[PDB]
Design a protein around this ligand. Structure first.
Ligand SMILES: CC(C)CN(C[C@@H](O)[C@H](Cc1ccccc1)NC(=O)O[C@H]1CCOC1)S(=O)(=O)c1ccc(N)cc1
Lengths: 99, 99
């Protein structure tokens, strides 16, 4: 699709067997999702921006379906105010910014 | 252009005759610039980011060039990790996400 930016670019994702809404965010290096369980090992990470930093759990090799497209990569899990699909996964679905 | 997301989508902007680097951020509703002098009056605004809500200064109807495209609109000034070009100005220059 071609998505305009008059409103937040929200899409449906499937992660961990769960359907969620998430923001396509070109300003985010990595994908961060609200608290949920994911399989495998994790390590702590700090990520920050407006308003400061939050602590998250970094899970690697996680499969997500993003508006119908499958991708694999790192997913951060923690107290993010919104679910964010970052560049690390948007590249895998071929997402680009065009103007 | 067509900007891929393997790297941060950093572009040059021009505001008040000065060149600056900024991030094209589809996850940002608003445009936020590092401390600088802008003309006119400002009004208060609260914005939320990954770490919580902050106060910023809101300046309206500010002329800004973004990767050589002219925009005129609201610019927020405050504590920000990077200069952020948000959806309010990305819409003006015709930017869309495509996959
Ligand atoms: C600030 C940029 C440089 C980085 N953030 C992404 C931004 O898109 C961020 C996303 C967001 C939307 C709404 C609520 C909370 C966060 N929007 C944001 O702050 O919008 C503000 C600035 C003006 O308009 C409003 S981040 O969330 O800190 C982040 C950092 C690291 C990773 N791996 C993932 C996310």
């Amino acid at each position: 699709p071609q998505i305009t930016l008059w409103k937040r670019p929200l899409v449906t994702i499937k992660i961990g067997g769960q359907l969620k809404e998430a923001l396509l965010d070109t300003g985010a290096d990595d994908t961060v999702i609200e608290e949920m369980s994911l399989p495998g090992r994790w390590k702590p990470k700090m990520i920050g921006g407006i308003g400061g930093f939050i602590k998250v759990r970094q899970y690697d090799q996680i499969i997500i379906e993003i508006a119908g497209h499958k991708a694999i990569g790192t997913v951060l899990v923690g107290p993010t105010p919104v679910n964010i699909i970052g560049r690390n996964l948007m590249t895998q679905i071929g997402a680009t910014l065009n103007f």
